[PDB]
């Protein structure tokens, strides 16, 4: 029941119609061979002579080459549509994954994301395309074989069309036995795999108590259970074939019996019997592989559903309409209070940062936890729960993301580097509207050209992954290049590494010194260089603003920052 | 090939010889039936004979029942040796995973250790057993059919016995050609999978730079490469089949030719010709499986080499012979200096840490680095590089591991809990030697009954994973119980979480208060109470002992420990 789902593949009907035309031939050939077999047995040997057996050795090879060629064209031009439908489905799937809000990507499910889409959407078309190349070749085969029986006989074909449906329902009940064994044995495999995993992870504890013996006996038990489970599934599998083989063979004995009755003879030259029986034993593969196409449509629609739940899911709520060119102003936090999904403890209780325009604030903290989740609010990676982030009199939930995100510039020491040319990694996303003179001048400005020129190709060397790359010592340096070129109005540094790289501080600190001479900048900081030059410093103790103040007028006021200053002198 | 293998499986010669005996019959059924086809055809319809035609349905049903029964037995009693050989190999593999150095389990082996060993073993058993099934059955099939052609003909059979080897070498060359395309597609397949993975590790930056435009196009190129690679593979696979079919069909036409070229031929009636041709078009499947056998052994021997590298690789270095009943005394570190494998920076530089007998020394480090790697040296989880660890005047590298570990009690949080009866945990590996009276006394001694009586059965309650699973604090309480039972002389606390102060911390301290009343004990520390009661406090800073003293006679010496006491006040 796929009505109202054809035009999803409508631009590819050429391939499918060639599949049909050159696929029904691949069964017409198989029927022609047996139909030929008849005039090669009676009319070739019984009728005393040659003049058939010089034709038919050529007709047989002709039919064979037709069969081979049709096999190739059918398989190839059905796999072409398979491929160009996998592409479209996977592309639309991916183009949906670049908007799904950050909360997901954050370790909710990323380990098997790409595999669980490519494997899944390759099993969604393998099964359906297999069902197609099965319900047509192996459905035309039946039509051809019955045609060729009737044109040669009158009775045997009738008992066969009465009798084969019995064969089919036998097929369908026995395969049902096998599937119903499969799921219970799946449940029995779950427990045994779980125990096998359980005994290991505490290896420390096994070795510390000197308890090897008990572990060996436990694995002996559970492995014998694995052996017995495999036994009970193979013992089930080995039955589903012979039973239906015997039902069909009993049909064969029946239709063989009906050749003894007096009327049936004299309608049976020594040939026609041979071709009718040949069609009987060739009909078996279509008749067995045709009444299990549900087992393929169901695999296909199962994977199709397990990815059509994914395709339309939640995305980043885009609300509001107002746009921004350059929000040269004051980002202010107001009573904001935010919670990670999947947890309970709030990360920020009532919070009141009041960033000046054109100045900088430094979020020194003893934790390393509870501060970097501000650099994930001022750019609306997440969305707050209770509060309001006023940006120039406006709320980030009212701005359109395309511009709000265009404001900030996450200059860090961990920036992911695209695997493309350097000058393309600096001017990223707008090589169209930037001129290479700007890229060169900024790469100089960021004190970055010194180690790009040494690179062999230069402004066309790949510094991304599966390329040649740049060490952690300029990853950030390129990042400053990017910020300078884009001239963002709001900066969020990380200073991720606890200390500057050897002989590399001279460039880092200098370039940053140009980078924050203007351009209001919330600088998450934990190093005594940028903090000292700060404008108003704000500490964070595990959930909340604690002790705010400029550095020079703070050390006298002991509090937290001086305490955290001493142990990091 | 493998003459040495037979005694590895010689216990199961019964199963294998039943496989062989009841498997050759399986091909004998097919050969007998094709033979029977003639007195169906010549003596059944040429003459007036109706005598054979009336028993023949019965012999057909009989031949099929023999065929089905032999199929079952030769598929069961060869998957009853496959089962036991894989089970034995697993048990001899795992019993070697309980000896490798702790550094292996550390993170070196992926959590798919179990999956890798089980899939390697299952697939080696599958490949080798399939090779046996194929070689024996199809050898019987070929021998039977060629017996068919001799007893029924004189020339066509020799034509085929000269001509089929050509078919076989065609098979080998074509399968080789497909197999090479397999790896050639495999390279770029892996490459493009990696290039697909690259994009979404840093999805953050893609949003933050507004670069969704230069992401969809990049994935368009990647997906087009994926579909083109799938196209190349499928277009390869659809040729390897329909070429050998054409070679064999050339053989078939040739056989027709020679079957009616001369007058010396034509002695074969309308019956026996059908037998010969049926035997032909049924001979192909053996002639393909038998000649691709060689590939099946390579699956099995490849995976078996993967196993046999692992099986006898390396274990924990056992040296020395000296044995200990109980090493009541004063373990001492002397100039010990240990380097983590896989790293460069030493974790412990020159150490002169002394642990007086009976007394307690407490390590208190802000780093979280360099502490919990002493509790992995006083029990030989690892082995030191430069130093000597005296234990009662002997060195740990001279004691025997089975004996030395008998004194150490890793009584911490997170202690792994076997999925067994509770009494088994608190008496692990020596329920043989220890009577339930000691368990029931110690469970009280640990003040641990509140996690026993309130449970369903208590001394029989399942509590590990796949059991009821109790609290993490309770898991620590079982660790104190288990320490109490064994009364081991050397104790190593961790004091990890410290969060359950809801009268649970009181219970913890109450239980421990007598656990370290004796038993000279190295206690990693972060709790003010246990540090206060210490006997010698030793603070480490990131690589090395810094200042050592007693809490009452240290605060006067401002040093480092007090400077940490301030922040952890």
């Amino acid at each position, epitope marked *: 029941t796929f009505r109202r789902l054809w035009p999803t593949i409508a631009p590819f009907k050429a391939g499918l119609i060639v599949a049909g035309v050159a696929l029904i031939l691949n069964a017409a050939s198989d029927t022609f061979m047996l139909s030929l077999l008849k005039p090669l047995l009676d009319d070739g040997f019984g009728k005393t002579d040659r003049s058939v057996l010089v034709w038919m050795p050529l007709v047989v090879i002709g039919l064979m080459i037709l069969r081979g060629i049709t096999s190739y064209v059918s398989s190839y031009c059905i796999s072409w549509v398979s491929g160009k439908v996998v592409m479209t489905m996977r592309r639309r799937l991916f183009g949906h994954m670049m908007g799904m809000p950050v909360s997901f990507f954050d370790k909710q499910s990323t380990g098997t994301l790409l595999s669980r889409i490519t494997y899944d959407s390759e099993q969604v078309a393998s099964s359906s395309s297999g069902a197609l190349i099965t319900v047509v070749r192996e459905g035309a085969s039946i039509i051809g074989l019955f045609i060729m029986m009737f044109y040669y006989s009158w009775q045997l074909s009738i008992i066969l069309i009465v009798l084969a449906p019995i064969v089919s329902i036998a097929i369908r009940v026995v395969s049902k036995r096998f599937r119903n064994i499969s799921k219970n044995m799946q449940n029995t495999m779950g427990q045994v795999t779980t125990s096998a995993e359980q005994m290991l992870k505490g290896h420390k504890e096994v070795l510390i108590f000197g308890g090897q013996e008990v572990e060996t006996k436990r694995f002996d038990k559970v492995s014998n259970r694995m052996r017995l489970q495999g036994m009970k599934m193979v013992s089930a599998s080995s039955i589903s074939d012979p039973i239906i083989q015997l039902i069909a063979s009993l049909a064969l004995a029946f239709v063989l019996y009906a050749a003894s009755f007096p009327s049936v003879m004299d309608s049976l030259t020594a040939g026609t019997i041979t071709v009718v029986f040949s069609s009987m034993i060739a009909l078996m593969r279509p008749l067995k592989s045709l009444t299990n196409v549900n087992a393929q449509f169901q695999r296909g629609m199962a994977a199709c559903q397990t990815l059509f739940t994914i395709l339309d899911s939640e995305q980043e709520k885009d609300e509001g309409k107002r746009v921004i060119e350059r929000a040269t102003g004051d980002v202010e936090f107001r009573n904001v209070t935010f919670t990670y999904p999947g947890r309970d403890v709030p990360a920020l209780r*009532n919070i009141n940062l009041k960033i000046p325009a054109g100045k900088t604030v430094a979020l020194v903290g003893r934790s390393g936890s509870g501060k970097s989740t501000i650099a994930s609010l001022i750019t609306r990676f997440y969305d707050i729960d209770e509060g309001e982030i006023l940006m120039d009199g406006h709320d980030l939930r009212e701005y359109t993301l395309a511009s709000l995100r265009n404001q900030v510039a996450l200059v860090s020491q961990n920036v992911h580097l695209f695997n493309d040319t350097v000058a393309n990694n600096i001017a990223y996303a707008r090589t169209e509207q930037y001129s290479r003179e700007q890229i060169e001048e900024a790469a100089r400005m960021a004190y970055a050209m010194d180690f790009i020129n040494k690179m062999d190709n230069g402004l066309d060397t790949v510094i991304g992954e599966n390329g040649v790359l740049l060490s952690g010592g300029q990853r950030q340096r390129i990042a400053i290049a990017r910020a300078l070129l884009r001239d963002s109005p709001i900066l969020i540094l990380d200073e991720a590494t606890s200390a500057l790289d050897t002989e590399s501080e001279r460039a880092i600190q200098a370039a940053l010194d140009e980078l924050q001479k203007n351009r209001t900048s919330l600088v998450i900081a934990h190093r005594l260089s940028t903090i000292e030059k700060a404008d108003e410093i704000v500490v964070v103790e595990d959930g909340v*603003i*604690v002790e705010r*103040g400029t550095h020079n007028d703070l050390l006298e*006021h002991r*509090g937290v920052y001086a305490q955290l200053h001493k142990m990091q002198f | 090939t493998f003459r040495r293998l037979w005694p590895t499986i010689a216990p199961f010669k019964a199963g294998l010889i039943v496989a062989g005996v009841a498997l050759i019959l399986n091909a004998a059924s097919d050969t007998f039936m094709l033979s029977l086809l003639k007195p169906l055809l010549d003596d059944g319809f040429g003459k007036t004979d109706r005598s054979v035609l009336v028993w023949m349905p019965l012999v057909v049903i009989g031949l099929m029942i023999l065929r089905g029964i032999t199929s079952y037995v030769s598929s069961y009693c060869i998957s009853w040796v496959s089962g036991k050989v894989v089970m034995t190999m697993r048990r001899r593999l795992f019993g070697h995973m309980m000896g490798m150095p702790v550094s292996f389990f550390d993170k070196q082996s992926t959590g798919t250790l179990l999956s890798r060993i089980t899939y390697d073993s299952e697939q080696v058993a599958s490949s080798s057993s399939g090779a046996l099934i194929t070689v024996v059955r199809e050898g019987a099939s070929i021998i039977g059919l060629f017996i068919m052609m001799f007893y029924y003909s004189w020339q066509l059979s020799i034509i085929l016995i000269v001509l089929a080897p050509i078919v076989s070498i065609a098979i080998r060359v074509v399968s080789k050609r497909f197999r090479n395309i397999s790896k050639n597609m495999q390279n770029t397949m892996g490459q493009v999978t990696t290039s697909a993975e690259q994009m979404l590790k840093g999805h953050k930056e893609v949003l933050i730079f507004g670069g969704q435009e230069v992401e969809t196009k990049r994935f368009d190129k990647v997906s087009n490469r994926m579909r083109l690679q799938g196209m190349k593979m499928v277009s390869a696979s659809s040729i390897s089949d329909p070429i050998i079919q054409l070679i064999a069909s050339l053989a078939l036409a040739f056989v027709l030719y020679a079957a009616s070229f001369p007058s010396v031929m034509d002695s074969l009636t309308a019956g026996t010709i059908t037998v010969v041709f049926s035997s032909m078009i049924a001979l192909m499947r053996p002639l393909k499986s038998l000649t691709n056998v060689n590939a099946q052994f390579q699956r099995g021997m490849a995976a078996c080499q993967t196993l046999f590298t692992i099986l006898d690789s390396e274990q924990e270095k056992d040296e020395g012979k000296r044995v200990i009943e109980r090493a009541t005394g004063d373990v001492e570190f002397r100039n010990v200096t240990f380097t983590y494998p896989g790293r460069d920076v030493p974790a412990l530089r020159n150490i002169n840490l002394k642990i007086p007998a009976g007394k307690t020394v407490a390590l208190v480090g802000r780093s979280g680095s360099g502490k919990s790697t002493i509790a992995s040296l006083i029990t030989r989880f690892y082995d030191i590089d430069e130093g000597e660890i005296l234990m009662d005047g002997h060195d740990l590298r001279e004691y025997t591991l089975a004996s030395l570990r008998n004194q150490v009690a890793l009584v911490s949080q997170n202690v792994h809990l076997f999925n067994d009866t509770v009494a088994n945990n608190i008496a692990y590996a020596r329920t043989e030697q220890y009577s339930r009276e000691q368990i029931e006394e110690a469970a009280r001694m640990a003040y641990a009954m509140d996690f026993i009586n309130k449970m369903d059965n208590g001394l029989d309650t399942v509590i590990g994973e796949n059991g009821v699973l109790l609290s993490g604090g309770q898991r620590q309480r079982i660790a104190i119980a288990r320490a109490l039972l064994r009364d081991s002389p050397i104790l190593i606390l961790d004091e990890a979480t410290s969060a359950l102060d809801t009268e649970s911390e009181r219970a913890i301290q109450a239980a421990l208060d007598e656990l370290q009343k004796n038993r000279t004990s190295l206690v990693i520390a972060h709790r003010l109470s246990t540090i206060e009661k210490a006997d010698e406090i030793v603070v480490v800073e990131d690589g090395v002992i810094v200042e050592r003293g007693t809490h009452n006679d240290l605060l006067e010496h401002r040093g480092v420990y007090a400077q940490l006491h301030k922040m952890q006040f």
Partner: nanobody
Amino acid sequence: QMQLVESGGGLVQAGGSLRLSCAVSGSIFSIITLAWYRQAPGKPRENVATITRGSRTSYADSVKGRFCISKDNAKSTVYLQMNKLKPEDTADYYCNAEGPAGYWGQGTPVTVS
């Protein structure tokens, strides 16, 4: 918006003892830094004592081991006790919170005989 209320005494004898309280409202009181500042008629503001999230304490060089500070968990009110008063310490005393560039109270002058 966090708010605070300052309570204090007035003129007292020299070398005596006094206790000062400061109420805090609309706050996460249990963690924020709290302190006291004094401002001379001629000299600017200056801190005297400071508390921290860990019940830590600190004092200036001028007054060391002379005054004592504490916080009340239930009442959300701090206490600062001054002992061995000095006439030269007669100035304007202020309650403060959340560091120096944070928030300030009304201020109650104290006179020493």
